[PDB]
Design a binder for this molecule. Structure first.
Ligand SMILES: Cc1cc2nc3c(=O)[nH]c(=O)nc-3n(C[C@H](O)[C@H](O)[C@H](O)COP(=O)(O)O)c2cc1C
Ligand SMILES: Cc1cc2nc3c(=O)[nH]c(=O)nc-3n(C[C@H](O)[C@H](O)[C@H](O)COP(=O)(O)O)c2cc1C
Ligand SMILES: Cc1cc2nc3c(=O)[nH]c(=O)nc-3n(C)c2cc1C
Ligand SMILES: Cc1cc2nc3c(=O)[nH]c(=O)nc-3n(C)c2cc1C
Lengths: 430, 430
């Protein structure tokens, strides 16, 4: 592999779980704490990370996780972070389902100008049915139609980004010609879902226009990402699954007539790094133990529930519960029984691990760096998006894993440049 | 008057004119120059200004002024400026015509959290017919209906801001109660124009919720501002007109059952401050002279056009042109003829002044401070929104006028507090 691996940092307030915020080290106000976001962003920039990433959603209930209840909105926090960072990308989730493309186009391009060409857009078709009812709609469109809407939305956004050629603004004080009128282009778009005349009232950025990220995993979504995205998010459930996703999406991109190397695949990992195997495992256990055990056992009960687990002593080995009642959830139950027997887990531990599974990327910096290199060399990844809910795991990753990857020649010593496109290794499409 | 006068700073890139950008001192890239915006914002904060203000529009053509062609978008530039300012308010224009209230509510409240309670919203019903065609509409609603839409939009935005009570987030790690469910409130709004269930996914800010600004001047708009706004923008065409506007809007606010002192009126002025009367006049003339004279004379020709002005020597006195062809534009033409005779203006000078009129607020700091005090004491203003297109006029205002108003006891020595509500003298509505 002639290329270097890249990382993004997902900054996610008090985190992705129901009860992680209860750890002594967590600031339960993190999700609306500007200092927290700034510190995390600057830590990722110290690690030469290609970008930070702000995930988003548009509907909550009393049962939504704490981070989702009360948090920053993405374009605003990214713009605030632009002023206190230098080279790191600024990638935010925005939905195609509700907001007009002119608005999204303008806000992303303005962020691109504020930041000197670091903006990115994680394009999502909102999957949250209730979000429709926050935006004056009775219901969401069906899955397939959501991706039709998204294609038109994206086409308009990119069309509007190209309203002005890169050299349109000649600013000639002597002649009074502020712009070259031949370099201005109206979109004049009249489609099924959007009608947008243009032109956009902001020109090209220092990277041309923002970078597009996408996370589709269905048949439709994978094809949409391969057709449209500069970078693609995916999961890291197993090396084998992630390798297959990578190859499939790269093949789709070729089918769409693109160079597959122009499509950068980033699986998400949440590594737990510590100086010893035992210290990392301790940190995992500290977090896994936070879940109210009754809630975890009840959720565990799902995969069995031919039994009442509240009979069994929590601190005795997981019972030999087992009845093939169809394959109702038997692919999982078999997995659960295996791991419980393999590591002699108690009922309590099984419940805790099901509520908060143990990452593969746990242990010493050398181990975690080696696994990352293995996934990279196996073409499971062009980089990773790194979650850091557990306090200190971003710091530990930057301080201890990055230098190993640098020493091994898999990671740069310095930022490639000042724009997101340059640091991802992409060109500017003007 | 027991209260102090307040100022806002309108930051407007290369400015509000067609040709001001051609002055030697102007940076023609100002409208997308982050440094320019940051410098202006910090200058206003040095002057203890209550807020900065970002105006906006959503439609352009080849004839739009240079600033409108290529500029920052408001929520993004305000959020970026939040990170490099401390106490000064952050007020942006957003339209009720196109964007959904959930989005606007979220973005403003997120800015309010990022900035520690400095956000403000200048609510406008977009008057630009072409903006409709940038947002998948055939045309704008009629004027009256635009204000009906705006009322519902604002009601939903404010409703959503109150999804969470100020003390809802108890963050009790020991019990696991992250929030008090009794302090969460769904909007469940089902109106003519919007249907928005809620709740909003961000809580109360340090000033409760953002401050609402409005600039309505029609019968309908004045009533809407008196009913809804915390602060109102208006013009400064003459002391008499602005006094009448002030009294009218304060009376309307009482009719709506509000305390008129809770409604702060800010006329817009663009002062030209210099150490001598003659130096200030020189600066005005330098800018007035930039307009292509042919364009200015043609525009001047409008108010006459019973003549071809290209006959008359530019540098000879303005002719005694005059025929009461109806009152077609005779209230103005009479004014034009009067001033030309009063100051013995040439054809060229008349054309130049019509293209770029001379502010009343021109001359020494002592004069400009005295005029401001006179307007304040006459109840024409609770403060002023200060434009600064001409390079250095914000600096000159802060450095030379503010200290006089401080010495005279009309202006504070220090910020009152860290929130926009506190510095405007308003309370938080929770
Ligand atoms: C790194 C990563 C980030 C994601 N961010 C979001 C997000 O911000 N908002 C969201 O609704 N879903 C997010 N997802 C979930 C994906 O959107 C979802 O799995 C995918 O869209 C399903 O594919 P489909 O659209 O074809 O159905 C993310 C997934 C990954 C792997
Ligand atoms: C200080 C000030 C700021 C203004 N900012 C904007 C603006 O950002 N966008 C806009 O379209 N109009 C702006 N205007 C123009 C007013 O919106 C317009 O004169 C007013 O809405 C007319 O009243 P009406 O809505 O009742 O018709 C501004 C006016 C003033 C005095
Ligand atoms: C990595 C990942 C992040 C996600 N983030 C959000 C989010 O921020 N808001 C939301 O409503 N849903 C999410 N969802 C559903 C997510 C899903 C995944 C897989
Ligand atoms: C003070 C003032 C500011 C304005 N600003 C804008 C603007 O930024 N964009 C726009 O399209 N129209 C404006 N308009 C029409 C304005 C009008 C006034 C009176």
């Amino acid at each position: 592999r002639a290329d270097f691996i890249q990382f993004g940092a997902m900054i996610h307030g008090v985190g992705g779980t129901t009860d992680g915020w209860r750890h002594p080290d967590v600031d339960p106000s993190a999700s609306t704490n500007i200092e927290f976001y700034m510190k995390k962003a600057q830590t990722a920039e110290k690690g030469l990370f290609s970008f930070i990433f702000i995930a988003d959603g548009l509907f909550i209930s009393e049962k939504s996780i704490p981070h989702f209840l009360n948090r920053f909105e993405p374009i605003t926090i990214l713009s605030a972070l632009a002023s206190v960072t230098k080279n790191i990308g600024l990638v935010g989730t925005f939905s195609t389902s509700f907001t007009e493309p002119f608005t999204i186009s303008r806000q992303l391009m303005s962020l691109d100008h504020i930041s000197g060409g670091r903006a990115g857009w994680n394009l999502v078709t909102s999957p949250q049915e209730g979000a429709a009812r926050n935006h004056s709609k009775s219901n969401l469109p069906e899955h397939t139609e959501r991706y039709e809407i998204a294609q038109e939305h994206l086409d308009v956004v990119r069309g509007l980004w190209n309203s002005w050629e890169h050299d349109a603004f000649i600013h000639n004080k002597k002649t009074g010609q502020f712009f070259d009128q031949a370099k201005l282009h109206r979109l004049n778009h009249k489609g099924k879902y959007f009608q947008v005349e243009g032109p956009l009232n902001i020109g090209r950025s220092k990277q041309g226009e923002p970078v597009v990220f996408q996370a589709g995993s269905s048949e439709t979504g994978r094809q949409f990402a391969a057709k449209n995205a500069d970078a693609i998010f995916t999961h890291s459930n197993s090396l084998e699954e992630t390798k297959a996703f990578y190859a499939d999406v790269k093949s789709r991109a070729a089918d769409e007539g693109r160079d597959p190397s122009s499509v950068r695949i980033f699986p998400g990992i949440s590594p737990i790094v510590a100086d010893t195997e035992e210290e990392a495992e301790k940190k995992y256990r500290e977090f896994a133990e936070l879940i109210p055990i009754e809630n975890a056992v009840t959720y565990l009960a799902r995969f069995f529930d031919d039994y009442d687990l509240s009979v069994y002593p929590l601190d005795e080995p997981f019972p030999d519960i087992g009845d093939v009642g169809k394959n109702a959830f038997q692919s999982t139950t078999d997995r659960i029984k295996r791991e419980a027997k393999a590591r002699n887990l108690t009922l309590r531990e099984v419940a805790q691990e099901m509520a908060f599974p143990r990452t593969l990327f746990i242990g010493t910096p050398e181990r975690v760096a080696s696994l990352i290199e293995t996934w990279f060399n196996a073409e499971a990844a062009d980089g990773f998006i790194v979650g850091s809910d557990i306090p200190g795991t971003l710091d530990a990753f930057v301080e201890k894993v990055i230098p190993i990857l640098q020493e091994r020649g898999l990671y740069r010593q310095d930022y490639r440049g000042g724009t997101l496109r340059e640091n991802l290794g992409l060109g500017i499409p003007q």
